[PDB]
Structures are given as C-alpha cells and as structure tokens.
Amino acid sequence: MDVFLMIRRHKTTIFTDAKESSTVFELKRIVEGILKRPPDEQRLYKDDQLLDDGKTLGECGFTSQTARPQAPATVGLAFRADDTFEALCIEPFSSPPELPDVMK
Amino acid sequence: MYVKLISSDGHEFIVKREHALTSGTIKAMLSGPNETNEVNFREIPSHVLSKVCMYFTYKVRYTNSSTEIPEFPIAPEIALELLMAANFLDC
Amino acid sequence: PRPVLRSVNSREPSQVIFCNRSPRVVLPVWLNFDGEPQPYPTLPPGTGRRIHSYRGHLWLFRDAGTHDGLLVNQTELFVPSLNVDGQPIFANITLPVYTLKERCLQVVRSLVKPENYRRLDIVRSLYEDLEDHPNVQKDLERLTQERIA
Ligand SMILES: CC(=O)NCc1cc(-c2cn3c(n2)CCC3)ccc1OCCOCCOCCC(=O)N[C@H](C(=O)N1C[C@H](O)C[C@H]1C(=O)NCc1ccc(-c2scnc2C)cc1)C(C)(C)C
C-alpha cells in the first residue's frame, strides 16, 4: 500500500514514499529527520487543507492510484519559527519554453 | 540516506542517496574534487529536474518486479530539455 | 550459416496466449527456421489472443509503431513448451523499465520527422542517438553474442 509523495515548501521539495496505513504524524517525523524541525513546528496541507495528525494518509486521500512513483501527490508544508505558523507557499516550477515548430 | 539536488532556478530537491545514485554523473559529483551531500545543476531548470527525480522513484520501484509496469509519461513541452538532462546524467 | 536464434522445425503444436499487459500496440515477431524475423497481426492494449504455435519456436514482441523492445515473461525471447494438462502457455507482454534517455528519445521520435532531427537545437551526438532507431535485427545480434557468454 505504498504511496509516493512530494513534500513541498517555498523552493524545497522532498521525494519520499509512505504507507496508506501510516499517519500524518509519522510523516512529520520523516520530515523532522530531514529538515531538522519537530512535528509541533510543522503543518501539512492537501491543497490548502490542514491535515489532522491522527488521520492516515489513505483517509487524507493519498491512495496508491492517486500517488504514483511517476506522478507523486503533493503535500504542502509550512513552518512556525516566529510565533504563529507561516502561510502555505509552494513556489511553482519553471515554465517550459515554446514547443519548437518541428515538434508541432 | 538523503542528498540535495539544486536546479538552475534555485529549487532544492531532497532525494534518497540510493535513488540519486541511479545517475553515474551524480555519483561522481557527490564524490567531488572533499565529498558533499548537495549538488548544483547550472543548466537543468526545476520543471526538468523534478521529472528526473520522479524517474529515480520509478526506476527503483519497478526494476525487478512482477507487478505490471506503467509508462513513464513525458509531456511534449518538456521532452527535449529532459533528453538533454538525461544525456548529461546518463540514466 | 545456422543462426543461434532460430525457431526449430518441430511439428509439435503448442497453444499459446499472447497477453498484452502494456499500453503499446504490440507486434508479435516470429523468428523463422533461418532466424529471420516475421511480423504477425498486432495486439491492441488490454487485449489477449489464443494462438496456434509450436514447441521450440522463438518469439519476440515490439511496439508496432516504433519497434521499441518489449519484454515477454520478464525476458526478451519467448519459446512455447508442451501444454501441461489443457493449459495454454501464457506470454505476458510488458513494458521494460526504459532508461530516461531512451524514453526521451521515444517521445522526441514520435513528435519529429527523421528529416527534421537536425533542426533541433541539440548536440550532434543526440542527433545520432535519435537516428539510431530500435532495430529487431540489431537486438538479435546483441542477444546472440550474449548467448555465448
Ligand atoms: C511457405 C512455403 O511454401 N514454404 C515451405 C517450404 C518450401 C520449400 C522449398 C524449397 N524450394 C522450394 N520450396 C522451391 C524450390 C526450392 C521447402 C520446405 C518448405 O517448408 C519448410 C518446412 O517447414 C514445415 C513447417 O511445418 C508446419 C509447422 C509450422 O512451423 N508452421 C508455422 C506456423 O503455423 N506458425 C509459426 C508460429 O509458430 C505461428 C504459426 C502461424 O503462423 N499460425 C498461427 C498464428 C496465426 C495468427 C497469430 C496471431 S498473432 C496476433 N493475433 C493473431 C491472430 C499467431 C499465430 C508456419 C506455417 C509459419 C511455417
């Protein structure tokens, strides 16, 4: 029941897998190991939807079919740092150039 | 365990070392002249390097598997830049 | 004189099911008794057909449009054996895990006429790579040299 994710914040992106049976809290611990900030200092989002820690990834809508190796599902991430949490801000990737005429 | 791959436009992709070591070029860049866990790609923009990281996940998952293998999708708009990247990374 | 990769002319029937477990239109290719590749009717994605074949006959499978290589039971070649019970031999045809480079070539080849390869703004060596289309006869030579070692 493996699920493939892109955890994104600002211009940072983490590629990682996880179980459907694994929880949002267990995902925060994985983020902690990488980005060195504890679970209480991070929020996880699903298109601007605050995910509950106790809920499973499957319950949040991160199914295997929806979150594939070739097309991972996005998880928003926002940190506290100052006092309150910062607003979610996923910086989009660069735009491709115009398709060459020969490829049209 | 993990490494950081940085695009030309400043996007940071954090990926399992094992996955990134799919690329022989990346292996050499990590070893360096003094090793490092970060690599900068001065000619690979974010929309390309993101696709490359997705391919690493794909390759590692579906190699040596009985389960049916889906296509690796490539939009026409990205194909040419991705080919250039793939040529350089040798994966 | 006598190619290593050839069908043997046994006259021992073998019922086979070609099962297309790929998103490609599949071309079945039969190697005749002199090891020459012989095309057969194509299989659309999501389809399978029960086929009359023989023991010791050699098959491989390609994308019908592009001649990209496909796997059959996780290998390149397929050889029907004797039907145990009344069971047909399954030949499950699947995508390989293409390198990223090869997969990019496949997509570029599909969008660009061969005559316009040289109009693309890329290094000369990538032109040569594009022009080196997946070839049945070349893959046989490769498999033949590997067979000895
Ligand atoms: C063609 C011809 O006439 N040549 C024969 C011949 C000539 C001479 C000769 C010399 N000189 C001359 N003539 C003139 C002067 C000098 C000498 C010998 C000679 O014969 C060679 C000896 O071979 C005997 C072979 O015995 C029969 C057993 C055998 O292997 N059958 C083969 C066969 O049936 N096959 C081969 C494969 O296993 C498959 C099967 C097939 O094609 N049919 C089923 C089929 C249909 C559809 C699908 C699909 S694929 C997706 N969808 C569908 C529906 C798949 C399979 C073939 C018919 C292709 C040979």
Side-chain angles (χ1 to χ4, degrees), chain A residues 1-18 20-54 56-58 60-64 66-81 85-104, chain B residues 1-26 28-33 35-58 60-65 67-91, chain C residues 1 3-54 56-84 86-118 120-123 125-137 139-149:
Chain A
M1 48 161 85
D2 282 347
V3 164
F4 300 84
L5 302 181
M6 256 164 61
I7 306 167
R8 301 191 67 191
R9 185 186 91 83
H10 288 43
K11 307 185 75 172
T12 300
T13 298
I14 305 174
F15 286 75
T16 191
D17 67 74
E20 285 179 54
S21 55
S22 71
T23 60
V24 166
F25 187 82
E26 288 171 5
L27 193 62
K28 289 187 166 73
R29 285 294 188 187
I30 296 162
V31 171
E32 170 175 46
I34 300 169
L35 291 190
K36 307 169 179 290
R37 300 183 106 291
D40 61 74
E41 287 186 53
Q42 49 177 290
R43 283 188 169 144
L44 294 184
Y45 291 79
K46 175 59 171 302
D47 297 297
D48 305 308
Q49 298 278 352
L50 188 287
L51 298 181
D52 287 289
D53 290 41
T56 61
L57 293 193
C60 300
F62 295 106
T63 57
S64 297
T66 308
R68 302 200 207 72
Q70 328 91 67
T74 293
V75 179
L77 167 69
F79 291 137
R80 182 164 66 222
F85 282 97
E86 75 194 358
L88 181 66
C89 182
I90 303 172
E91 212 60 54
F93 303 129
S94 50
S95 291
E98 299 296 290
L99 198 75
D101 181 51
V102 152
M103 277 177 95
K104 295 171 180 162
Chain B
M1 186 74 221
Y2 281 81
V3 302
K4 180 181 286 182
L5 309 182
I6 304 172
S7 68
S8 60
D9 55 308
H11 272 99
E12 308 181 312
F13 300 98
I14 300 169
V15 167
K16 296 175 187 286
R17 171 166 285 244
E18 37 262 277
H19 287 196
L21 287 186
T22 298
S23 173
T25 302
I26 293 178
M29 285 172 95
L30 287 176
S31 58
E35 292 200 292
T36 180
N37 293 308
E38 300 187 357
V39 181
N40 290 261
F41 293 101
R42 296 177 299 174
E43 283 182 290
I44 312 186
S46 49
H47 67 282
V48 179
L49 186 60
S50 58
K51 264 292 194 184
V52 168
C53 294
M54 283 173 199
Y55 176 79
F56 294 160
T57 318
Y58 172 76
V60 173
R61 171 62 184 70
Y62 287 117
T63 51
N64 303 4
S65 73
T67 61
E68 189 186 310
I69 298 176
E71 197 88 64
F72 190 76
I74 301 172
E77 295 74 49
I78 305 174
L80 192 62
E81 285 175 306
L82 188 62
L83 177 66
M84 279 157 74
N87 189 53
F88 179 71
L89 293 174
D90 187 57
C91 63
Chain C
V4 176
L5 274 53
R6 64 183 181 251
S7 290
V8 174
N9 188 11
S10 80
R11 303 173 195 72
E12 296 172 52
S14 178
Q15 293 291 102
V16 169
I17 293 179
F18 291 171
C19 189
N20 188 1
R21 288 298 196 74
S22 87
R24 308 307 190 75
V25 176
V26 170
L27 176 75
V29 182
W30 177 64
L31 299 185
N32 73 4
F33 306 116
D34 301 300
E36 293 276 50
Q38 223 62 226
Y40 269 74
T42 60
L43 299 179
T47 74
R49 290 175 195 162
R50 185 171 185 108
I51 261 63
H52 287 101
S53 199
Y54 300 78
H57 281 213
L58 264 72
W59 294 84
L60 61 163
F61 303 78
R62 316 296 287 219
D63 181 301
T66 61
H67 296 86
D68 298 315
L70 297 176
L71 297 187
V72 55
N73 301 322
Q74 308 288 255
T75 53
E76 292 83 358
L77 299 178
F78 171 72
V79 173
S81 55
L82 281 304
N83 298 295
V84 182
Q87 294 180 240
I89 307 304
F90 265 82
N92 299 305
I93 311 156
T94 69
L95 277 184
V97 181
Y98 298 113
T99 67
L100 180 60
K101 186 175 179 183
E102 182 58 57
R103 181 66 195 124
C104 289
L105 289 174
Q106 290 172 6
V107 168
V108 169
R109 284 175 188 133
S110 72
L111 294 168
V112 181
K113 271 75 168 299
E115 69 217 77
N116 294 132
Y117 288 165
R118 300 276 171 166
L120 292 171
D121 186 19
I122 58 183
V123 169
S125 67
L126 275 181
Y127 299 144
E128 295 171 348
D129 289 338
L130 278 168
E131 291 167 2
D132 189 9
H133 286 65
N135 183 250
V136 173
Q137 184 55 46
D139 288 314
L140 288 183
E141 293 165 357
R142 165 174 147 285
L143 287 173
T144 297
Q145 292 193 73
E146 280 166 40
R147 179 59 64 76
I148 78 188

